[PDB]
Design a protein around this ligand. Sequence first.
Ligand SMILES: Nc1ncnc2c1ncn2[C@@H]1O[C@H](CSCC[C@H](N)C(=O)O)[C@@H](O)[C@H]1O
Ligand SMILES: Nc1ncnc2c1ncn2[C@@H]1O[C@H](CSCC[C@H](N)C(=O)O)[C@@H](O)[C@H]1O
Ligand SMILES: Oc1cccc(O)c1
Ligand SMILES: Oc1cccc(O)c1
Lengths: 268, 257
Amino acid sequence: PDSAPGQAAVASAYQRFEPRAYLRNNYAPPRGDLCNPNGVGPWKLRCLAQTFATGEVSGRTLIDIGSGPTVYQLLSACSHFEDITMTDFLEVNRQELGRWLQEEPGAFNWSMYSQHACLIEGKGECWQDKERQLRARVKRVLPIDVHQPQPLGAGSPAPLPADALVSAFCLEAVSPDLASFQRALDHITTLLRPGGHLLLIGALEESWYLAGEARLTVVPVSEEEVREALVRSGYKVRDLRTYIMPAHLQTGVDDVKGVFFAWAQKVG
Amino acid sequence: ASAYQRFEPRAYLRNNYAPPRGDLCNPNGVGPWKLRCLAQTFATGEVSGRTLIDIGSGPTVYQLLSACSHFEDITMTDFLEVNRQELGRWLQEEPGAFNWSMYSQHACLIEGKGECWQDKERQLRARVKRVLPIDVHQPQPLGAGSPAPLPADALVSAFCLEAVSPDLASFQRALDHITTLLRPGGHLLLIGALEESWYLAGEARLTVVPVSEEEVREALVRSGYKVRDLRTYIMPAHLQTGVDDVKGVFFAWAQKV
Ligand SMILES: Nc1ncnc2c1ncn2[C@@H]1O[C@H](CSCC[C@H](N)C(=O)O)[C@@H](O)[C@H]1O
Ligand SMILES: Nc1ncnc2c1ncn2[C@@H]1O[C@H](CSCC[C@H](N)C(=O)O)[C@@H](O)[C@H]1O
Ligand SMILES: Oc1cccc(O)c1
Ligand SMILES: Oc1cccc(O)c1
């Protein structure tokens, strides 16, 4: 039938999305604890650092899809791309990012994440330098809607097509069903050049998460469903790993069972 | 040397461990060079045991960051009470403690074990059992009935001896004194100023004995050490700040025979 109904429920639910609560829920401890090497934060950072460390993912332009109020997903990326586009559906998230870009004190503090990224990249970089570079290389923060065939709109500011895409915890968190998820992946895929790379991180078998007042409906996906959608979109899957959420990190902020990381390269 | 009675801890930490000398971002600065010497030395695995004493800690902890994972019992020392108080403020996470986090981070970075800086800090705090008075001019620097386990398996001392000695001879004697504290076959990590004659600490102006790398070498030998490593950092111009006239910094790894 049609996609409007579910898409409309999603947009409606996000009107209540609270950036600070979401940051607290997922990026403050225990989930944001970077000392525990078995924690989810360290694993996410590690997937990104190792992928970029192959030297196989480079270019001039990078687009981060559904950045929300977070930047950790770009810490290892930023040394490999000189032009970075960050994006989100919600103005309030885009402002949160604005706060970090201006280095305001009222901003969320990512320095543990910056430090940790420096630590595992193994180049002796201080975190203030990593941050300075991320801030310099973010060239724009744009509204985005992945349900649109042109997710950035027509006549986008963004350099297109990009050399690479990053997207963490977006697609499954905004798609009422798997077919919607697939279409979203198809949409963002039009922004990536052939032979370009997508780094996709996401929730496994999740149906809801909390962001303050907002309780959001997530399509629960399996690793295998993630693989097939990537193939369906015209990628070769180069890496797909799974982290199983330990019980102690199951805090009632969501019903997440695990997290996936895909490295995929667009065929062409 | 009652000049040390006017010595202000915060002023000293300010002059030496805040920007520019305390910026650790640039790999060519003195802070990173110092941490590197300590890290690489312990990474060899040849310096180890159970107990370690830090001679003339002042109000600083950076010199034990790499050390702390190799020794379960650590003694810190200084001549000034005010310094011992400043140490205590950091060990006990009290208010207005100096912020060493940048240094903990850099040690974690250099060590390359994937360790978070908070774990590093917690372990150092855990292994420092006591902060004791000391005078290297005394034949028994720690006094007679010290709480400190002796003889130590290892010593560390940074910027103390030359900074408390009017001349080479006094420097040599003080080296003799601290050396009695070290078990035979033990290790000493000595860091110090090269060709320095004064530095400032608030109202205090201290006299320093200017020493050369050769003179440091010979002093260690004279004290019965085998010198396993002696390295020099030349002080770049941008780190010549008005707080002293230091020319360079030396790092020595020495073993008692
Ligand atoms: N239709 C849509 N198209 C693109 N992004 C959307 C969207 N609807 C909601 N979003 C955004 O999807 C995000 C999911 S939270 C993920 C945030 C971040 N990437 C991280 O790694 O933590 C929210 O920021 C939300 O505003
Ligand atoms: N007679 C003495 N015996 C032992 N230490 C002394 C001393 N007189 C002064 N000191 C201490 O020697 C220190 C020199 S500054 C100490 C340097 C510090 N450990 C660092 O690495 O930065 C001061 O803390 C001072 O209080
Ligand atoms: O970072 C996130 C976002 C949404 C669900 C989740 O389990 C984790
Ligand atoms: O850390 C120090 C201590 C004393 C003199 C100096 O130049 C540096």
